[model samples]
Structure formats: C-alpha cells, structure tokens
Target: PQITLWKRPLVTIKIGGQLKEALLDTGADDTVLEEMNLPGRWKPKMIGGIGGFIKVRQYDQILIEICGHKAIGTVLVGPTPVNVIGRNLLTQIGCTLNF
Candidate 1:
C-alpha cells in the first residue's frame, strides 16, 4: 500500500492482542510504544529523538501486527508522545519511502 505524505502516516497496529495507533516514522531507527505491561524480560535502554533522549524498556522478539502484516522484532516501551513504528519494524514490513 503506497501512502502519501499529505499528513502523518498514522496506522493501526496490534500487539499482545491489543490494538493501538502508531506513526510510521521513517527517521526513527527503533520501534517505540507507549508505556504498557508486556509479558517478557526487557533491558533498560535509552533512545534519543529530536528533543532529547529518554530511558525505555526494550523487549525483544515481540510479534506485532502492522496493518495486518505480522513482524517479530524488538519494541521499546517508554513515555513517548506517541506510538512509533520505526525503520526497525518498517523494514520488516517492507515499508519504503517514495515520492
């Protein structure tokens, strides 16, 4: 599905049987989700963005459904302003930037 850049590329995604909205951010290197309870072990990680950096919990090998496409990868839980599907998961789902 080709998406236009008219607005932010926000889409619905499923994780742990729960649905959530997230941004398809091309600039981001890692997928970051809003703080939530996920079953598994995680390591403390720090990520930086436009404003600054924040500490987050990194969970590995999590299965996520992005617009009906499933991809198992790492997801970071933190106080991000919004759920972001970064290049990490985007690449798995075959997302590419085109004008």
Candidate 2:
C-alpha cells in the first residue's frame, strides 16, 4: 500500500515487538530505531547528518512492518531524536515519493 508523504513523513511502524512512530527519511542509509537492545553487538558507526555525527549500533537482518507491510532488514538502535525508516525498508514496503 502507498502512503501519503506528510510534510514530516511520520508513520506507524513495528520494531522488535513494539509499535512506534517512525520518520521516513530517504536520506538516511539505514533504518534507525530509538534505544533498544539488539543481539550480536556491532562496532559503533558515526552517522553524519544535519544533526551532526552520532555513534549508532547496527543490527543485521530484523523483521519490521511499515504501513502493515513486513520485511526483514537492518535496524540501527541508538540515540536518535526519533525512529527513522530508510529506503532499504521503504523499498520493501513498495513506498514511493508522492510528490
């Protein structure tokens, strides 16, 4: 299903087993979730953004649902202002820019 791109592009999504609202940021390389413990820890990655760089823990291959569409992909759990869904997961959900 296609989702209307809001000015802020916020939508309901599932991470781990919890429900939360995530921002759709095509500019982001990977999906990033708010703080959560993921198995098999990884080296912290410095993600440079408009908000500056921050270390993030990347988890490989996890199931997620966006706009009710399910897909298994990478999810980075770290200190972010909000949860973010990148193009990797967005493509799986068949999402496209409306405008």
Candidate 3:
C-alpha cells in the first residue's frame, strides 16, 4: 500500500508470533527492535543513530512478517524508543521511496 510522508510511516509487524509496531526507516541501514526475548545466540555490537551510538545485540536469520510480507534478515536488539525496519529488511520487501 502506498503511504504518504505527511505522517510517520508506522506499520504493524509480526515477529515470532508477536505483534509489534515499527517504522519503515529508509535512512537506517540495520533493523533495530526494542529489547525482547529472542531465541538465539547474539553478539555484542554497537550501532549509531541520529544522536549517538549504543550497544545492541545482533541476531541473524530472524523471521519478521511486515504487513504480511515475510522477510528474514539481521535484527538488532537495543534500548530504542521505537522499533525500526531498516534498509536490510526493506530491500527484501521491495520498499522504495517515490513521490
């Protein structure tokens, strides 16, 4: 579905059977999710946002259902104000910016 930039691009997504709301962050290179329980081994990594850098756990091969479209990619677990679906997953979902 085509959306307007007049409002924040917030969308409902399903991850591990759990429902969540995330932003389609075109500027972000990696997907970042709020800290949660995920079954897998993760590595300590640092990520930078608009403000600064923060530590996060990196999880790979995670399945996420974004607007009913399934895409598997690397997800970062961190203390973020909101969940972000970045370019890594967005590319898989074929999302592009168009006027």
Candidate 4:
C-alpha cells in the first residue's frame, strides 16, 4: 500500500460575486486568478512579464480565505485564465520556497 500527502494549502477567492476554490502555490510570482469567472465590470490592465510584456488585467481588492485566515489584495486579471496563487501571498505568510 502506498500513501500520499498533500501539503499545499487550498484557498478561496471571491470573483464576480462568487467564491472559487484555488490551490495556493508559493512558487508563482504573481496572483493569477481566472478571467472567465471574473465580473464584467472588473476592468484590468495588461502588464509585462518575463515573456516580454504579456497582456494581463487587474482586479480590485479580492477577499481571500485561507486556513481560516482572511486577506484583501489586488489580484492580477490574466487572460490565460488559471487560478494561480503567487508570491504576493507566500510573502505575506513568510513562506520560504526551496528548489
């Protein structure tokens, strides 16, 4: 028999007046949230990245709930459309990621 353990934390983000579950990743560099689930009025902007200025939008303060802890911060609105938990959060919790 083999057993596996999941150490990563799971958090929830409120987008478009709805709550969505997302996996918290400390390796990511930015707060990547889903674009499809975002509200229509939440206007964002395109920003530059390692890939030469990719088109990324911005969101206002988002309510994040993680392990009973809550936080509010601006989430980057990405067109790629993936719920990516990034450095903005990892740094807040004082997490050190090792290769």
Top model by lDDT, which number?
1
lDDT scores for all predictions? 0.94, 0.80, 0.93, 0.61
lDDT of 1: 0.94
**Which residue pairs show backbone clashes in model 3?**
none
Off by over 4 Å in 4: 1-17, 36-43, 47-53, 93-99
TM-score (all chains, Cα) for each model? 0.96, 0.83, 0.96, 0.58
For candidate 2, write residues 1-99 as lDDT tens digits: 455653687888876677889898888878888887666656677676687888888777888888788989888778888889998898888877765
Count of clashes in candidate 2: 0
At residue 92, give the lDDT of candidate 1: 95
TM-score-best of 2 and 3: 3
**Better-scoring candidate (TM-score), 2 or 4:** 2
Candidate 3's C-alpha runs over 4 A off are none
In terms of lDDT, model 2 sits at 0.80
Model 4 poorest 10 in a row by lDDT: 1-10
Per-model root-mean-square deviation over C-alphas: 0.7, 1.9, 0.8, 5.2
Which model, 2 or 3, shows the larger lDDT? 3
**How many residue pairs clash in all the candidates, one count each?**
0, 0, 0, 3
Worst 10 residues of 3 by lDDT: 11-20
Could you tell me which residue pairs clash in candidate 4? 44-58, 45-57, 48-53
The true-versus-predicted C-alpha distance at residue 48 of model 1, in Å, is: 0.8
